[PDB]
Every structure is written in C-alpha cells, then in structure tokens.
C-alpha cells in the first residue's frame, strides 16, 4: 500500500512494519470477500474487526508497552494505521474495550440510547446471546 | 406507560404511498339556527309595488 506522504518515516516504523502489513493484508482479503453467507450487515463485521485490532496494536505500543516513539505515533495516525477518535474513546476509563465507534453514537438508535455492545453481561438479562448489529460484537 | 419516540426517517426518499383518498372529517356540520327576524308578509300592495 502507498503511504501517501513520501516524507521519510522515522525510526520504529521498521519495527512495526510486518505487524501492520499482516493486519492490512487481512483487511484487504476481508474487503474482497463476497456478499454470500452474510445476511444483511454481517459483511461489515470483519471490516470493523480488522479495524479494531489495528487500533489496539498502536494503542498498546503507545500507552501499554510505551515502546513506540511519539513521532512514529503521530505518523501512524496521519497515514491511517489507527483512527484518532478510536484512541480518544479508549483513553477514558468508562470505555476501554468498546466494539465500534458507531455503537457509542447517541443519535444512532431509534429509541435514543446506546447499543448492547456497551453493556456488561452482569447488568444485562440472563438469557441473551445477542450481538450488536451496528458494531459487530459485544 | 409507553414512551413516544419518533422514528427519524431518511431525509432523502420518495413518499411511501400515493395521494390519500381517505375521508378526513365528517360531512355533517353543527347547523346553527338563524333566529334573525320573524319573516312575514309586507302588505297587500307589496305584489303591486
């Protein structure tokens, strides 16, 4: 894939080069998957699932492990390795394992509330194996 | 108790039905009476005047 900047990315990008390439090749193979098998919105579920794992790799390298530099962190967010809004929602203590950024939108639901993805299982009902249609999982 | 949550429809769409041919109201009225003045004959020369 083209980096779309051509501006000589700094050190640490070669350390995260094959890891981000394997996640990018997984999303491109998921984007080339046909519409068979998925019912109506299940085909967009591996699109957010590969995007959720791509944002978790950069955030763990910056906040958890703190091994990547801040100059390589800003170059990764600008080139499109991880969304800045997804890292902003994970900075708050109220949401650290959110499914998708579409599930946190208050205006998305018809009843004007959150989804089942942003709800714990202990506070939910007993018999419920439901999954979020907009987000993708719990 | 039932919450009235208005569903936000798509603001780019053709209308869901044709022109409504249903009756909206009732063709009877409240026919209020006149009670203006007692109508009577004018005169015997009213046919000649």
Curated annotation (Swiss-Prot), chain A:
PROSITE patterns in UniProt: G10_1, G10_2
GO biological process terms on file: mRNA splicing, via spliceosome
PANTHER family for the chain: PROTEIN BUD31 HOMOLOG, PROTEIN BUD31-RELATED
Modification sites for N6-acetyllysine: 123
Tissue specificity statement from the Swiss-Prot or TrEMBL entry: Detected in epithelial and stromal cells in benign prostate hyperplasia tissue (at protein level).
Endpoints of the signal sequence: none
Lineage of producing organism: Eukaryota, Metazoa, Chordata, Craniata, Vertebrata
MF terms (GO), sorted A to Z: nuclear receptor binding; transcription coactivator activity
Disulfide bonds: none
Keyword Membrane: no
Domain of life: Eukaryota
The entry's keywords: Acetylation, mRNA processing, mRNA splicing, Nucleus, Spliceosome, Transcription, Transcription regulation
Descriptive protein name: Protein BUD31 homolog
Entry keyword annotation includes Ribosomal protein: no
Main location: nucleus
Subunit structure: Identified in the spliceosome C complex. May interact with AR.
Residue positions of motif Nuclear localization signal: 1-8
Interaction with AR: annotated segments: 57-65
Functional description taken from the UniProt entry: Involved in the pre-mRNA splicing process. May play a role as regulator of AR transcriptional activity; may increase AR transcriptional activity.
Localization (cell): Nucleus
One Pfam family matching this protein: BUD31
Family: Belongs to the BUD31 (G10) family.
Entry comment, domain topic: Contains a short sequence motif (Phe-Xaa-Xaa-Phe-Tyr) that can bind to AR and may modulate AR activity.
Gene Ontology annotations for the cellular component aspect, listed alphabetically: centrosome; chromatin; microtubule cytoskeleton; nucleoplasm; nucleus; spliceosomal complex; U2-type catalytic step 2 spliceosome
UniProtKB/Swiss-Prot annotation, chain B:
Residues the record lists as Phosphoserine modifications: 29, 37, 39
Region: Disordered, residue numbers: 14-38
Position(s), cross-link Glycyl lysine isopeptide (Lys-Gly) (interchain with G-Cter in SUMO2): 45
Annotated localization: Nucleus
Family as reported in the entry's similarity comment: Belongs to the SNW family.
Subunit structure: Identified in the spliceosome C complex. Associates with U4/U6-U5 tri-small nuclear ribonucleoproteins (U4/U6-U5 tri-snRNPs). Component of the minor spliceosome, which splices U12-type introns. Interacts with SKI, SMAD2,SMAD3, RBPJ, RB1, PABPN1, MAGEA1, SIRT1, FOXN3, U2AF2, DAXX and ATP1B4. Interacts with PPIL1. Interacts with VDR and RXRA; preferentially associates with VDR:RXRA heterodimers. Interacts with NCOR2. Interacts with MAML1. Interacts with NOTCH1 NICD; the interaction involves multimerized NOTCH1 NICD. (Microbial infection) Interacts with human papillomavirus type-16 (HPV16) E7 protein.
Functional summary from the UniProt entry: Involved in pre-mRNA splicing as component of the spliceosome. As a component of the minor spliceosome, involved in the splicing of U12-type introns in pre-mRNAs. Required for the specific splicing of CDKN1A pre-mRNA; the function probably involves the recruitment of U2AF2 to the mRNA. May recruit PPIL1 to the spliceosome. May be involved in cyclin-D1/CCND1 mRNA stability through the SNARP complex which associates with both the 3'end of the CCND1 gene and its mRNA. Involved in transcriptional regulation.
Name of the molecule in the record: SNW domain-containing protein 1
Organism: Homo sapiens
